[PDB]
Amino acid sequence: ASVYAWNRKRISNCVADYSVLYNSASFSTFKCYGVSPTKLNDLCFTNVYA
Amino acid sequence: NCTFEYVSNLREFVFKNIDG
């Protein structure tokens, strides 16, 4: 979607593996704020917005 | 707005809601 019409996806109840994405050179930018980018798989939250 | 979706004489059921 366009940046002004940014799309939002809701993520409830699904396991995800942020290690295969952090280890990928395809992503030109991977920067995290408030949570360490390395320690990401351990964290648990009730909902995720994308 | 959907936040969950699951798919799987006398009958008795007990419905309760405790600690979320």
Method: cryo-EM
Of A40, A12, A26, residue with least CA distance to B1 = A12
Q: Which two tokens stand for residue A33?
A: 């704020």
Query: Which chain A residues are closer than 8 Å to B4 by Cβ?
Result: 12-13
Q: What chain B residue is nearest to A13 in terms of C-alpha separation? A: B4
Number of other CB atoms surrounding residue A18 within 10 Å: 15
Q: What chain B residue is nearest to A46 in terms of C-alpha separation? A: B3
Cα A48-B1-B2 angle, rounded to 5 deg: 70
Query: Which chain B residues are closer than 8 Å to A47 by Cβ?
Result: 3
Cβ neighbours for A13, distance < 8 A, ≥ 6 positions apart:
B4
- What three-state secondary structure class fits A49? strand
Q: Resolution, in Å, please? A: 4.6
Query: Is the torsion defined by CA of A42, A45, A47, A49 positive or negative?
Result: negative
